[PDB]
Structure 1
């Protein structure tokens, strides 16, 4: 029903984090804290790792 998905930073820092989302939804776009640039930037869904 859900999926674990990897979202990378739009700051180009290479930072990324994994969340869960419903499989029937679209690609996630979130505002998450990026510790490399020390501020909150956009992250968007690039990959799906496994099914939840």
Structure 2
């Protein structure tokens, strides 16, 4: 099995997260994270 590096995109602005994911894909990656610009809790979507 392998580990995939994925780049998450925020709904608003240029904020971008970088995190690791599993080959088998136990839990598909969708987050609630922190955006600096609006100073908010956000929904981050898995991207490349």
Count of matched residue positions in the alignment of Structure 1 and Structure 2 = 46
User: Could you tell me how far apart the structure 2 residues matched to 1:43 and 1:6 are?
Assistant: 10
Kept in 2, the 8 Å contact 1:27–1:44? The answer is no
What root-mean-square deviation, in Å, do the aligned CA atoms of Structure 1 and Structure 2 show?
1.4
Q: Please, what TM-score do these two structures have when normalized by structure 1?
A: 0.75
* Contiguous gaps of at least 5 residues in structure 1: 48-52
Greater share of strand residues, 1 or 2? 1
* Contiguous gaps of at least 5 residues in structure 2: none
